[PDB]
Design a protein around this ligand. Structure first.
Ligand SMILES: Cc1cc2nc3c(=O)[nH]c(=O)nc-3n(C[C@H](O)[C@H](O)[C@H](O)COP(=O)(O)OP(=O)(O)OC[C@H]3O[C@@H](n4cnc5c(N)ncnc54)[C@H](O)[C@@H]3O)c2cc1C
Ligand SMILES: Cc1cc2nc3c(=O)[nH]c(=O)nc-3n(C[C@H](O)[C@H](O)[C@H](O)COP(=O)(O)OP(=O)(O)OC[C@H]3O[C@@H](n4cnc5c(N)ncnc54)[C@H](O)[C@@H]3O)c2cc1C
Ligand SMILES: Cc1cc2nc3c(=O)[nH]c(=O)nc-3n(C[C@H](O)[C@H](O)[C@H](O)COP(=O)(O)OP(=O)(O)OC[C@H]3O[C@@H](n4cnc5c(N)ncnc54)[C@H](O)[C@@H]3O)c2cc1C
Ligand SMILES: Cc1cc2nc3c(=O)[nH]c(=O)nc-3n(C[C@H](O)[C@H](O)[C@H](O)COP(=O)(O)OP(=O)(O)OC[C@H]3O[C@@H](n4cnc5c(N)ncnc54)[C@H](O)[C@@H]3O)c2cc1C
Ligand SMILES: O=C(O)c1cncc(O)c1
Ligand SMILES: O=C(O)c1cncc(O)c1
Lengths: 369, 369, 369, 369
């Protein structure tokens, strides 16, 4: 029986672990945290990611208790400039813990071995995984799914571009307050941009009837706009119509201002070691394909290993087949983010939705635009 | 190697033929008419039907050149009373010929044997099918997919319950005429109801950028409102905003008329004989689930034939499994037609969508409401 | 010093009394009832009537505590079909008691002699007025301003044309209830028409921040729709959006009902006798010009009495001058009532507003359309 | 017979001349231009100014061929932030030449003597007017109505604040293009403000069915925004929806960028000399009361001279009675303009409309807010 060691219990690792376990691999997953959790309040998935969940036998638990807005709306200075529905392309908004719980339960149900407080600090391409405790594990496959600061990656050395954005945002979950919001289209996704009187933006994303996901974006050199817990006045000033929710947000002390880190590698594989997710391809958040591409790539990895070839050859086949979708998506996402292209609305072009349109299960592009 | 005779080349018949063929059946399809064609109208499919198409390998041909409206809108006396998007549950509008062509080509590529000009007139519960020429064809399974006037079930004697509505409607296709329509949300499904000055309803359905599907509903007891070619005046009178399109519609010397009609049977199976589509369960078009349930039931038929039983025991287990869903859908659809409930808007409740939520491939309900 | 007896303390009577008084007439006013009061409804005045009020020195008391709606809106089956603002032509809504109180106080300040509990029963074309007590009062001018059942003209015998509508309506006042009404443009005049399920119309008229004037129209042949106190169900059924206000309206054990009624006379003058207001020209309330034409005609009466003629020659020159305007307005108003034309919206055409455009002070038409 | 010499044939002088002539003054008006014309494309008048026209016997010719928008709307970054109707307060938009022609025709009809190419260069308080030609005129009254650079004022010496604004605007008349503008509320007044991506603003004011008045405002140090003829690209960029009209505006070569000059004086009178209009009180354009206050003041001057006192004493009475309305209005207007207070909408407060509410004919405040 083939043995897999997965480093990282985020979406990438849990996806890889479940996918491999379903193919009869024996699999242990290492999470360095004392407990399995997800961070970042909310998340969008699209058709591509939802297809992975389906292939993971975890779709049902994700749809139940999540939400598809009637429309994806963009505002500039409180003026609606676009409403997009993507010609029926499936998409979904949920809390990070909602998507995460579904993945964990599915992994435990298949009998994936999960070690918490277990941190990968080095990996050898001949299939050896070194933990912080000193323990050394032999395996036929080693998946580095350990985030943007991947120690699996850096222990081996991968030529790479790695940098951090100037600005970031505060992501949080607050009650919907839908009756308090009064008249309007409050089940929509609404990207509310402003450049006057200053640069402040909210991405309003309903997760379900109870929970609203908010991304509060202001420049890092805005001492008030970037404060956590949120400086209520400067947010209520530019978003009066979101006051009830902003009030609940001011109450939260777990709130943080996060900047965005990206990584581009020349290669995602070295012998028996594969890098998936942010370890290999962290990107600007603009197209909300960060975890989708991670899940697709993780899922596609288990597929390429069902071909009868050596683990080394499958991995090279894997990357060659799957990476260009992620490359174009990261490039376009970076371009959008640095140009603030989303603020114009109607940005979800056919090209922008390429990653979203990919079906990992049948390996084709679906939902044409 | 099991052998199957399928009577009628409609959606239910083609679905049945392809599904069996994919499972290794030798299948032959008899089409009464001189060729394979559809009524020249539009049609709605939902998640349940789309999943069947995925299961038959015909999803991609369909999605290409079809449209998901941004919303499903209901009007009452030109006042918007409802916008619905079904919490993300997939759906689609397309011409009937579009759906047909995809099923036909998939049927052909797989090597189904399609006999045109060939009319089934009788079937035996021991496994025989009689054509209009009196010729007797043997097989291990006979599929009555011959529509509402099904000779195959009439030849055997099935106790039908029948029910007819006061309403009928005209289904046709015209150019989108989108500029001439001027200002509005003309990519929507708009269900335009009126009770004053008289009962007249137009279902407005965009199929793609070139073709608009119109459903013109009126009491059958209305000489003008049910007239094909269409009585241009009575329609423009109550729907002035659709004038350009209606002008192209009174130009059609031939167009499909139907009186709403719902038939429920004591059973669907007699020995080696199975009834699918309108033959088994024709319903009132309120919930746009006729072809949907047909396809689900035709596809589900080949599923139960795989579990290693006699064709007879399988057909019984089939109906026992898949039927209640069709029954509940037919009942609710007929109730809506009678009380004209769709004029109220917001009528696609969780109960109304139970059919559409059902996933035939995995045999669960998805897309919770 | 000429001397005048005016019968009836309505708008036409008060206008007449004040106008003559300002010109040096000694004037006495007889009010049948125990005191001076108005029906407890609302009322529309236009430029023509406002100019009369300016001419009587009573404009300012009126404008204070009255409202000009931002627009005059027409609905059909809850669909907005019309917004009108009359190219700036002035207009106003106010309670009837508001208009009354201003005229009364102006009448008093000028020293008009107001006799209450005093009922005119007959008048002589030689200059005599008979009270219910049989007492005969002499004067140089008698003014029949005693309303629709005018004893003063009946005593003399005027050939009337009469005409009655199938419709009547309930006029009442309730609190504005503006928060409870929620989202909308609730300072508008909204004329809410319905023909389905049955003919029911509500004229929605804000008078000021505290008081809302409602006109509930229904066929007189409708037992429920014409019932005062109001049949709460039938109204909330067709007007759910006005529920809070209607709740306060079914709380009124007494409220003004009127069947539409239009009377045209062979003439308005007999010798020294002049007829004004409903006495002379009661009309269908479609164009809200009854009190308007009354006041214009009462005010115009004192104008012709100044040009140095016999009271008899003056009264003749008066009608010859001012009457056609009232005739055209009465005809068009009656036509609108009969055909229920106001349901179509945009019905305040140039012709429909000829009355309102007329300026009594300068004797020209203003505010062209 | 009293003789008046009026310097200046703008709205102030023509108003004074007509008013005085109507009171039996003999009056000559001096206009330094070779021909009588008005400049500045369009103009707003309100109730106060319309009341003066009424008192001048020139109201009728102004209403005919002018326009009252349904509403006064304000936009910020294409988002409607206010719609104001001023509780029925009359107001009107017209071309400058429309208001001017009415005044000229009325002045000629009364027999006002009009000398063109006649420029006042000095005035003596004992009633002497010196022209550029050398001619010296004796009179009982001398009205300085000669604009912001009043030579009547400066020949005598009046302590004063006089300055020029930093920015200005381009005012022009173009065809309505109402069909080309497509869907919207294109009979409204719309003040369209923007500060991002740059400071550009259009005041959109319909004058009648044929003529639209546009004020294109950009800073003086914007080389493109301030160009005449207009730089079409930078205007179409921020106002795409006004393209058809902007195209017609680019065509005009008479277009100029004008800055705003103001004057505040300690006194408006010296002996027999009175200053009216911009000569005495030019103000920031924000409240559109520039010509209204001029007309009110001019008209009020003829009133104070019908009191039987000396011309010197009437003039002191005149200013004392009438000036504070103009003072508060100019101060508020200046405050608004420098603060760009109009951009917030809902700025036409009761206080802002004080000047507008004044009725010069009855000397009271009307149309309460
Ligand atoms: C602001 C923002 C908004 C975003 N919105 C979306 C969105 O809407 N939709 C979307 O699809 N994507 C979105 N993304 C991107 C998405 O969050 C990431 O692409 C995704 O979380 C990557 O998951 P991962 O499992 O590869 O990495 P991670 O989530 O970083 O997970 C790795 C897990 O690694 C564990 N671990 C770390 N180091 C070790 C180690 N050395 N040994 C063992 N375990 C280790 C980490 O602690 C954690 O448990 C967004 C990103 C940002 C920044
Ligand atoms: C007005 C109206 C609107 C509708 N809208 C929708 C909608 O939006 N969505 C939806 O899912 N459903 C809709 N339906 C219902 C849907 O059209 C039917 O349920 C569906 O077409 C049934 O297909 P079928 O193949 O069973 O029957 P049919 O389409 O009637 O096809 C049978 C085929 O039978 C062949 N055949 C018949 N008899 C013989 C024979 N004796 N021998 C050999 N061949 C024979 C027929 O000629 C034809 O080729 C609607 C129905 C109506 C009436
Ligand atoms: C439903 C409805 C809605 C209307 N809405 C409007 C509107 O919006 N705007 C508008 O301008 N018009 C409106 N009108 C019409 C308007 O109400 C009348 O034209 C107006 O009230 C007529 O006033 P009047 O003074 O002539 O008569 P009345 O108001 O009838 O007054 C006469 C006065 O007559 C006294 N009197 C009567 N008989 C005698 C007597 N014999 N002896 C002594 N005193 C007597 C009466 O008691 C009372 O004091 C409406 C009318 C109706 C029916
Ligand atoms: C951009 C802008 C927009 C405005 N919008 C409005 C508005 O919407 N509504 C409003 O009410 N006001 C408005 N105003 C203000 C309004 O234009 C002025 O207040 C008004 O034109 C003043 O008129 P006047 O007759 O006093 O002066 P002027 O119009 O300057 O007229 C004097 C006349 O003086 C003649 N003349 C000059 N010198 C002599 C001389 N020495 N001897 C003899 N004749 C002489 C001038 O040539 C001309 O014929 C606006 C002003 C600006 C700048
Ligand atoms: O920060 C963003 O631009 C962003 C854009 N889309 C989804 C999301 O979760 C975040
Ligand atoms: O420039 C202005 O602010 C202006 C404001 N109101 C009316 C007008 O004609 C101009």
């Amino acid at each position: 029986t083939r043995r897999a060691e997965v480093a990282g219990g985020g979406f990438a690792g849990l996806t890889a672990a479940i996918a491999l376990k379903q193919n009869g691999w024996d699999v242990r997953l290492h999470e360095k945290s004392s407990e399995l959790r997800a961070f970042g309040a909310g998340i969008y998935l699209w058709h591509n990611g939802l297809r992975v969940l389906e292939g993971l036998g975890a779709l049902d638990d994700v749809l139940q208790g999540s939400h598809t807005p009637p429309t994806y709306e963009t505002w500039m200075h409180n003026k609606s400039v676009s409403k997009e529905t993507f010609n029926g392309l499936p998409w979904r908004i949920m809390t990070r813990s909602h998507l995460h719980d579904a993945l964990v339960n599915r992994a435990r149900a298949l009998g994936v071995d999960i070690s918490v407080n277990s941190e990968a600090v080095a990996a050898d391409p001949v299939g050896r995984l070194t933990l912080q405790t000193g323990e050394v594990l032999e395996a036929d496959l080693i998946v580095g799914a350990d985030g943007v600061g991947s120690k699996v990656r850096d222990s081996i050395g991968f030529k790479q571009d790695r940098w951090v954005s100037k600005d970031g945002l505060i992501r949080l979950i607050v009650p919907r307050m839908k009756k308090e919001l009064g008249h309007g289209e409050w089940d929509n996704t609404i990207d509310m941009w402003n450049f006057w009187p200053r640069v402040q933006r909210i991405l309003y994303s309903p997760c379900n009837e109870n929970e609203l996901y908010l991304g509060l974006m202001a420049p890092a050199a805005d001492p008030r706009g970037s404060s956590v817990p949120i400086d209520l006045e400067v947010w209520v000033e530019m978003f009066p119509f979101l006051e009830p929710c902003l009030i609940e947000a001011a109450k939260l002390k777990t709130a943080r201002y996060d900047k965005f880190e990206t990584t581009k590698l020349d290669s995602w594989t070295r012998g028996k070691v594969a890098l998936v997710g942010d370890a290999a391809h962290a990107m600007c958040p603009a197209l909300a394909q960060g975890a989708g591409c991670a899940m697709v790539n993780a899922f596609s990895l288990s597929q390429d290993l069902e071909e009868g070839s050596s683990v080394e050859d499958a991995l090279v086949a894997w990357e060659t087949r799957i990476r260009p979708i992620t490359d174009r998506c990261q490039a376009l996402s970076g371009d959008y983010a640095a140009n603030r292209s989303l603020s114009k609305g109607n940005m979800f072009t056919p090209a922008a939705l390429e990653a979203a349109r990919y079906d990992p299960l049948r390996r084709v592009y679906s939902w044409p635009q």
